[PDB]
């Protein structure tokens, strides 16, 4: 069979330029790549938060080190997401926060420290799980950098950056490596009688042909949904939010520091992200139009940050869900054209480079063997539905009951069998997926991470943070007092590391400044 | 001169039964009224939306309160029309909606709040005009009722109802009051040598005579057009749509609520109405056959609502325009026999009862003084052409350029001198017609409303919603800082009212249910 020679990517947002760059790198020879993007249709870039696989799967693949791309996108550091006011109905006299940290919780004799922590909690231990089981949360409270001043990494972390700048950076990178860029707008898509894409007709009268089409057109799914008619599976029965109101808010970094984490601040009818970088933070109130109006939600977002009726706002709507199939015939959807999940756990850009990784892993020839696309499609469904369930578990496990929105989340959601099963194991006191890999191994082994994306520590951060704990500690521990004492020594080491970080790390603001404004 | 004694109405649709009922009520003595309607020729009833004068001019005249007629027609509430995707080319990531609300915008020192809002917008104020100037749009977003649970009206509103049921209700009402109903079909119309209608010959061999004939035969204009040869002024040079594909779509009211407004959803080659009531919504894609085929437009309508190729559809065509004269000799046209304008601003049923009001105001004797019919005809021309221009202003002011249809609307329409003049005043920053009347006064003074049917607030809802704003705020305001501060207090009161409505109104679904399924 003839190899794919010509590839056309529709879309110049983060997805299209990630696609262009990943494919140009992956396809060393024989491929001609063209990207068409409209000057008239804006990209989606709100201020974006990411996870460690961005470097390991995406930039490392391109051969671009962190120090090369970070400054060009005004990158900042992200060590966690901090959930605020999620646990029960907010009270301004009470500090309700918890962290979801990157990285694996250590095991002690085959049992994760989360489980020894729970046994202590049964005996009256007061410290929250993540402060007991991870060395870094107090450092995040102190707004400390993830690295020593000399750049030596001290905790697993990822990035916050200007999403437009990321698209721009990759545009430059891809074009320089032979990617053909066309600034124009696709107006019609012709299919042959068999249902394959023949060509794209553009506003300026260009006819684009290719062996392979990558739909990066964003939520409109110009090829996959509109031309190819692939059903979008609306998952608004699983998750209620459908809207965001977003802006950048200036930050007084010299006075207030730069928080080395994304915050998720539960609101009345959704939650507000906060994504700090030097000089400002991206923020957006993700809300459900069924429970609040855009105008009301806008009042709230402005009130939250003391912002004026004059502050210009990025008003957004979205459909939650995914295509029935991500790749149909000769078209692969990547990015917002493929699926969307609210940004509660920073999975959006992950879905782009994870899908691209899988595309290259299942790369077709011009015959388009359906066995390849079937296998690819199955990977995408696992990836998405697994993240959807994880996000949904933040909502159905909450103890908040103060608004219609929170009550709906507690009572009215449709839950997959898979998430019910995980919750059941957790409640029984069983660990979820654990590994004896350290973080380096995990984050360097994407075939492992892709299929084991949420580990025991991830579930525990969320469920413990939200105040849903197992019915009991692991029965096995009752037989293992030596192991319990071994775990005590491990908790002691974590505390020692935390105290060392406290006095060793520069502030995030100082470190970012030393990398340079 | 001898009074009119015998009246024959041809047609049993909404127009004929409104005519029968209005005339039987108006003509207390000396009139004998017969209505002939064919069992073989269907009525036009799609699911219909109305305006407040329906109660004030029509049902109040009959002496029928809202609570008497509403339940019998499965009525629902309408507080606005919500225009979706009209402002620029649709993007599924963007919420493009605006409301056209019933009721007058308040004045502050002789200047409408729309104009203070514009001055704020010049200074960076971000809130849309209708959310600033009216207390109810956020309540409509929350699908709230127009009344408190005890029925106390909280905003100006009108109705959605089953149009067949309305015709049926009035049929029963009119017949009970002495209207003679004949189920038969007129097959020939005899004119005397002078051109007056002598008689109607029917299929069953009846010969109908009368002093006065009311043509309610619908678009065929059996008497006015076909027998009397009155020219129809085709206005397809002003407005491009000529077709609709319509259906009822089931609604999940318990899950999704019942929207207390009509929606106008701009499509590729026209727009789709949505008219909610309990259990379902009437919908129709109004389109231009010049830009799309009925088959294509049907695909779109089905796609819009996720409907099946098995869904039976009300396929419609129409001519836009009006007779050169509505009343000729002894025949008065009322309803679709007189004129048609696409339902963009819910004027169709208005044209019926407004025309009937004017008929009674110009009521003839058997001599048919042409001074009476001339005066009546002039009122009808003003009424129609004024609404035509208002509707047309939705089309020529749009910024959409994504289809041939939208481009034609921006560039290819013939505009009246009257509408050019209004647009010019608006662009100069001048208010259009304002009144210091409150809504109660306006809607109780039909001689005022009939001649001042679109006020400043109506034009501003549409032009601001579509994104065409004046070149500048009113120069006068530069001299009136105290007035500007007074307006601020008024905007503050509106916001307070909006927040009170948010927590005080029942949902529209709940309220309608309490009135009863
Ligand atoms: C509210 C919100 C918050 C988010 N937060 C995060 C986060 O914190 N972290 C994270 O990782 N991800 C986040 N995401 C996801 C992230 O923004 C997207 O995954 C990412 O930016 C890629 O978008 P995209 O390129 O698929 O689509 P878009 O940005 O919508 O780009 C679409 C491109 O296609 C072009 N186009 C469309 N139609 C045509 C046509 N007819 N002809 C030519 N060009 C066309 C447009 O011009 C544009 O270039 C968030 C998303 C949303 C909506
Ligand atoms: C697509 C569309 C959407 C609309 N939407 C709205 C809206 O949202 N709101 C609104 O207020 N209005 C709306 N209208 C207008 C509204 O439907 C009409 O104004 C109204 O229902 C009255 O119609 P009619 O009685 O004039 O004619 P028809 O309903 O066509 O009735 C004609 C009557 O005359 C009879 N007839 C015809 N010829 C003969 C004959 N030879 N002998 C005996 N009987 C005869 C028929 O049997 C029938 O009884 C819309 C109209 C259309 C076409
Ligand atoms: N395996 C992913 C899990 C993840 C996604 N979003 C997160 C946010 C916070 C912590 C972990 C995550 C990671 O460690 O990167
Ligand atoms: N004077 C009419 C104007 C009107 C017609 N159709 C409308 C639709 C929405 C708002 C106002 C209107 C009214 O207030 O009833
Ligand atoms: Cl995300
Ligand atoms: Cl109408």
């Amino acid at each position: 069979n003839k190899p794919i020679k010509n590839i056309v990517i529709v879309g110049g947002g983060t997805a299209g330029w990630m696609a262009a760059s990943y494919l140009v790198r992956a396809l060393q020879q024989q491929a001609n790549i063209t990207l068409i993007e409209s000057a008239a249709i804006p990209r989606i870039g709100v201020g974006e938060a990411t996870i460690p696989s961005l470097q390991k799967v995406f930039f490392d693949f391109l051969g671009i080190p962190e120090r090369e791309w970070m400054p060009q996108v005004n990158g900042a550091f992200k060590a966690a997401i901090k959930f605020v006011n999620w646990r029960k109905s907010p009270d301004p006299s009470r500090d309700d926060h918890f962290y979801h940290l990157f990285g694996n919780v250590p095991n002690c004799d085959g049992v994760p420290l989360t489980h020894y922590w729970l046994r202590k909690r049964e005996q009256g231990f007061q410290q929250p799980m993540e402060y007991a089981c991870y060395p870094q949360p107090g450092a995040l409270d102190g707004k400390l950098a993830p690295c020593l001043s000399d750049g030596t990494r001290q905790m697993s972390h990822a990035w916050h950056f200007d999403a437009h700048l990321v698209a721009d950076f990759l545009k430059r990178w891809a074009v320089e490596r032979g990617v053909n860029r066309v600034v124009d707008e696709v107006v019609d898509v012709r299919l042959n009688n068999r249902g394959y894409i023949s060509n794209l007709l553009t506003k300026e009268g260009r006819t684009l042909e290719a062996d392979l089409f990558i739909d990066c057109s964003g939520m409109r799914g110009l090829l996959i949904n509109q031309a190819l008619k692939e059903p979008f599976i609306d998952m608004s029965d699983y998750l209620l939010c459908d809207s965001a109101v977003a802006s950048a808010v200036p930050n007084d970094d010299a006075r207030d520091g730069v928080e080395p984490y994304t915050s998720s601040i539960a609101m009345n009818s959704g939650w507000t992200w906060k994504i700090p970088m030097l000089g400002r933070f991206g923020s957006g109130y993700v809300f459900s139009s069924h429970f609040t109006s855009r105008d009301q939600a806008t009042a709230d977002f402005l009130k939250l940050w003391g912002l004026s009726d004059n502050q210009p706002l990025n008003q957004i709507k979205f459909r939650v869900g995914r295509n029935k199939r991500a790749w149909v015939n000769n078209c692969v959807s990547i990015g917002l054209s493929s699926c969307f999940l609210e940004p509660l756990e920073s999975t959006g850009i992950y879905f782009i480079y994870a899908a691209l990784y899988q595309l290259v892993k299942h790369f077709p020839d011009t015959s388009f063997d359906p066995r390849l696309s079937d296998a690819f499609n199955a990977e995408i469904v696992h990836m998405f539905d697994d993240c959807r369930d994880f996000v949904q578990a933040h909502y159905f496990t909450t103890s908040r009951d103060d608004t219609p929105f929170w009550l709906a989340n507690r009572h009215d959601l449709r839950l997959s069998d898979a998430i019910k099963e995980k919750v059941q194991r957790y409640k029984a006191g069983l660990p979820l997926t654990t590994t004896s890999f350290d973080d380096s191994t995990y984050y360097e082994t994407f075939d492992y991470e892709f299929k084991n994306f949420w580990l025991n520590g991830n579930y525990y951060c969320i469920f413990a943070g939200l105040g849903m704990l197992p019915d009991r500690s692991l029965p096995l521990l009752q037989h293992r007092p030596e192991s319990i004492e071994k775990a005590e020594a491990m908790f002691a080491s974590i505390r020692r590391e935390a105290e060392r970080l406290r006095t060793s790390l520069p502030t995030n603001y100082d470190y970012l400044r030393s990398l340079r404004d």
Side-chain angles (χ1 to χ4, degrees), chain A:
Chain A
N1 301 333
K2 175 204 149 174
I4 301 294
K5 192 186 280 187
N6 301 311
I7 302 168
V8 163
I9 300 159
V10 173
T14 304
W17 287 115
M18 283 193 160
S21 64
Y22 201 88
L23 290 175
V24 89
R25 176 63 155 191
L27 310 178
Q28 292 296 313
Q29 331 278 311
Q30 308 211 42
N32 183 45
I33 304 168
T34 302
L35 188 150
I36 174 163
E37 50 169 316
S38 172
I41 303 165
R43 295 185 298 214
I44 280 219
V46 286
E48 269 80 359
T50 55
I51 62 178
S53 52
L54 176 68
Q55 185 65 41
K56 304 310 302 205
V57 172
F58 185 74
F59 287 118
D60 278 354
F61 184 74
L62 298 191
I64 305 176
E66 204 181 326
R67 59 187 195 277
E68 194 196 320
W69 69 264
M70 250 193 105
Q72 314 216 33
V73 304
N74 296 330
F77 294 114
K78 179 193 171 188
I81 303 176
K82 191 175 88 177
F83 288 87
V84 176
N85 287 350
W86 272 80
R87 189 172 162 153
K88 69 266 287 280
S89 304
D91 186 332
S93 80
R94 307 293 164 198
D95 168 12
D96 173 4
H97 79 276
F98 64 90
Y99 290 100
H100 181 200
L101 301 126
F102 294 120
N104 192 29
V105 178
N107 298 301
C108 179
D109 294 342
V111 176
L113 251 16
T114 51
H115 292 236
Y116 296 92
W117 168 84
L118 183 68
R119 203 208 51 97
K120 292 173 70 158
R121 195 191 177 277
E122 281 171 334
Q123 288 166 112
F125 192 63
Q126 295 291 309
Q127 193 185 32
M129 186 283 298
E130 83 284 37
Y131 285 83
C133 293
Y134 298 82
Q136 74 272 41
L140 309 188
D141 294 327
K143 297 178 195 152
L144 301 184
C147 294
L148 298 172
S149 297
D150 68 14
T152 304
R153 179 169 45 258
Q154 293 293 282
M155 59 192 75
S156 296
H157 70 90
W159 311 270
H160 296 151
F161 50 56
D162 193 307
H164 282 319
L165 296 181
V166 168
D168 292 349
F169 174 86
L170 292 170
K171 173 177 55 169
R172 289 193 298 277
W173 192 90
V175 173
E176 128 83 11
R177 276 147 192 85
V179 171
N180 312 289
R181 184 185 178 239
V182 176
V183 181
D184 197 1
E185 181 167 309
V186 177
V187 297
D188 292 312
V189 180
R190 281 64 163 278
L191 312 180
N192 66 22
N193 279 7
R194 290 214 306 101
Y196 280 61
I197 306 181
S198 290
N199 60 59
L200 314 178
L201 179 70
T202 74
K203 187 162 185 185
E204 279 171 13
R206 283 186 197 81
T207 295
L208 300 187
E209 300 193 333
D211 298 311
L212 176 64
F213 294 87
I214 313 297
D215 187 345
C216 298
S217 64
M219 296 183 199
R220 77 192 57 203
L222 176 91
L223 310 188
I224 191 68
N225 298 130
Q226 297 179 329
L228 288 170
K229 317 292 184 195
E230 190 61 12
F232 183 83
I233 304 169
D234 184 6
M235 284 171 184
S236 61
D237 42 346
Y238 290 79
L239 296 164
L240 310 177
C241 290
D242 61 3
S243 303
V245 47
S247 201
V249 179
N251 199 69
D252 191 347
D253 292 354
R255 188 183 79 224
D256 295 333
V258 178
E259 288 163 348
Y261 50 85
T262 296
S263 305
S264 167
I265 299 156
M267 301 292 282
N268 285 342
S269 304
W271 62 278
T272 293
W273 78 73
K274 188 186 174 183
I275 294 170
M277 26 215 161
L278 272 181
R280 81 274 287 128
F281 59 92
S283 188
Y285 176 9
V286 173
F287 66 97
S288 170
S289 72
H290 301 282
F291 293 91
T292 193
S293 73
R294 186 174 299 281
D295 198 64
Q296 178 181 39
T298 291
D300 293 4
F301 172 79
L302 304 163
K303 209 222 170 182
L304 179 61
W305 305 119
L307 296 188
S308 66
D309 257 308
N310 289 27
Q311 174 129 2
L313 302 179
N314 185 355
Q315 303 287 1
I316 293 157
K317 67 185 202 214
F318 53 75
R319 208 140 48 123
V320 175
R322 58 158 173 84
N323 297 332
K324 189 181 95 248
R325 291 175 298 182
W327 173 356
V328 176
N329 299 338
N330 59 342
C331 176
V332 184
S333 57
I334 299 294
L336 297 176
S337 67
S338 175
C339 61
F340 178 76
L341 179 60
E342 69 188 87
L344 194 56
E345 289 287 353
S346 300
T347 47
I349 293 167
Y350 173 70
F351 293 157
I352 300 170
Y353 59 76
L356 287 170
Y357 175 87
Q358 293 303 340
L359 176 54
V360 169
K361 292 295 182 170
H362 294 88
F363 202 73
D365 60 38
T366 57
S367 83
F368 286 96
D369 180 355
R371 298 173 295 188
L372 297 179
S373 46
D374 284 351
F376 170 86
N377 283 340
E379 298 303 334
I380 300 304
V381 164
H382 152 271
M383 171 192 76
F384 184 82
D385 286 1
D386 182 51
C387 284
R388 175 209 54 206
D389 285 354
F390 189 79
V391 165
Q392 187 196 52
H394 294 53
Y395 278 113
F396 66 68
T397 53
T398 189
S399 288
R400 287 194 60 163
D401 53 23
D402 51 295
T403 74
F405 173 79
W406 293 110
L407 281 176
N409 283 302
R410 305 220 316 151
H411 299 124
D412 298 353
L413 306 188
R414 165 183 175 193
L415 273 65
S416 74
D417 281 356
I419 196 59
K420 281 173 178 180
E421 183 174 304
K422 288 173 186 77
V423 170
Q424 193 180 254
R425 279 189 301 276
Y426 171 86
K427 283 179 151 283
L430 289 169
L432 290 172
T433 297
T434 63
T435 187
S436 41
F437 301 152
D438 58 21
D439 294 340
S440 286
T441 302
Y442 180 79
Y443 286 120
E444 290 166 22
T445 312
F446 194 50
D447 274 355
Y448 182 82
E449 170 173 29
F450 181 79
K451 297 290 180 73
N452 298 281
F453 190 65
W454 306 110
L455 298 177
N456 179 77
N458 301 113
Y459 286 100
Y460 257 81
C461 281
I462 302 307
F463 295 157
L466 295 169
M468 171 184 86
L469 296 178
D471 292 349
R472 64 190 54 83
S473 53
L474 255 200
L476 178 61
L477 297 179
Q478 294 306 306
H479 298 96
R480 296 188 64 91
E482 278 198 12
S483 300
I484 287 167
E485 287 319 293
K486 186 156 156 183
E488 283 305 294
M490 289 187 64
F491 287 122
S493 296
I494 290 163
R495 187 164 286 185
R496 282 176 203 121
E497 188 171 340
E499 166 60 17
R500 188 173 63 247
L501 298 179
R502 185 205 137 235
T503 72
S504 303
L505 298 163
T507 65
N508 189 42
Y509 171 60
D510 282 353
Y511 186 57
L512 289 170
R513 279 200 305 126
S514 79
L515 293 178
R516 230 75 103 281
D517 290 284

